[PDB]
Each structure stands twice: as C-alpha cells, then as structure tokens.
Amino acid sequence: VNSFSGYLKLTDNVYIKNADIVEEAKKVKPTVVVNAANVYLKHGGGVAGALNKATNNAMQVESDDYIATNGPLKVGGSCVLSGHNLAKHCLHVVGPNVNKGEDIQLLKSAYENFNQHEVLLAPLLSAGIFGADPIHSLRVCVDTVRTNVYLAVFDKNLYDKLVSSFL
Numbered sequence: 001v002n003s004f005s006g007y008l009k010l011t012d013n014v015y016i017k018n019a020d021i022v023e024e025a026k027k028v029k030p031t032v033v034v035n036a037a038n039v040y041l042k043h044g045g046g047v048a049g050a051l052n053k054a055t056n057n058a059m060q061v062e063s064d065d066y067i068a069t070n071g072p073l074k075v076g077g078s079c080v081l082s083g084h085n086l087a088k089h090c091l092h093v094v095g096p097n098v099n100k101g102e103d104i105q106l107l108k109s110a111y112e113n114f115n116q117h118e119v120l121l122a123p124l125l126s127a128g129i130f131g132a133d134p135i136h137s138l139r140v141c142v143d144t145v146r147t148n149v150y151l152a153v154f155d156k157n158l159y160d161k162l163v164s165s166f167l
C-alpha cells in the first residue's frame with residue numbers, strides 16, 4: 001500500500017492520472033520523482049522548468065555542479081540527484097527530443113532507467129515540448145517499465161485521449 005490517490009490502473013504495474021507533477025510531488029513526497037531532463041540538466045521549460053522552479057532553483061544549482069564534475073548525460077540515460085522539497089530523490093531521465101532529430105528508438109532505453117526503482121512518480125517521457133506522441137510514449141512505458149509507475153499527465157484533454165485509446 002502506498003500514498004498515491006486517484007490513479008486509473010492501466011496494467012499490473014502502470015497507473016495514470018490527470019495531475020500537475022509538481023503539485024503531486026509536493027503532496028505525496030514520493031521516494032522518486034522523475035524529471036524530463038535534457039543532457040545538460042538545463043531545466044528551462046516543460047516538466048523540468050516546473051520542477052526546478054518549485055525547488056527555488058536548488059535543483060539547477062545541484063545540477064550545474066553535477067555537470068561540472070561528470071559532463072553531460074547520454075540521450076536515453078539518467079542520473080539520481082536530490083529530490084529537494086519535492087521527493088527523496090529525483091531521477092533525471094533524458095528521453096529523445098524529436099525537435100532535435102533524436103532517435104525515437106531511444107525512448108525505450110530512457111524508460112529502462114525506471115526499472116532501477118521500485119516505485120516512481122513520473123511524466124510521460126519525450127512528451128510535451130520533447131515533441132513525441134504521448135500515446136506512443138505511454139505504450140513504450142507500459143511495455144518497458146516493470147516497477148510501479150504513477151504517471152502524472154498535466155493536460156486534461158490529453159489524459160482522456162490516452163485512457164480512451166489505451167489497448
């Protein structure tokens with residue numbers, strides 16, 4: 001039993017909800033919140049911009065130190081950093097950004113990072129400003145992630161479409 005509330009169950013391990021991931025994280029304080037990161041951990045917009053703003057820019061300060069030490073992530077890769085006031089940990093996961101021409105096949109590799117954590121609050125990878133089809137992202141999620149994932153979908157119109165079209 002966990003503290004997530006109001007999710008629709010899609011499969012044995014995948015759950016979905018119309019919610020603002022920032023507000024959901026503040027309420028649940030999950031062990032792991034997933035950020036829709038880019039390889040530079042520059043949290044300018046989308047989910048990343050919103051998660052960072054909620055931390056009063058502490059996420060960005062920590063991220064800049066991480067990059068200065070370790071260099072950029074790989075597309076499809078991830079790193080674990082602090083969750084600040086939102087969660088115990090933040091798993092920064094880089095899905096391909098279609099508006100940069102990156103291979104959509106890397107979306108599966110990106111979701112594989114979730115399997116290193118028993119329970120996660122997450123957005124759909126590569127959705128929103130990363131330019132991928134959220135219906136496809138949900139399909140890859142369900143077919144790749146085996147751990148317990150709670151998906152927060154910001155747009156109410158999009159959520160109903162994902163549910164209604166889910167096979």
Ligand SMILES: NC(=O)c1c[nH]c2ncnc(NCc3cc(O)ccc3F)c12
Nearest residue numbers: 020021046047050127128152153154155
């Ligand atoms: N600034 C942001 O994007 C977000 C900030 N918090 C969030 N919490 C959950 N979902 C989000 N985006 C999902 C989304 C995907 C899509 O394809 C179209 C619209 C849309 F809203 C965001």
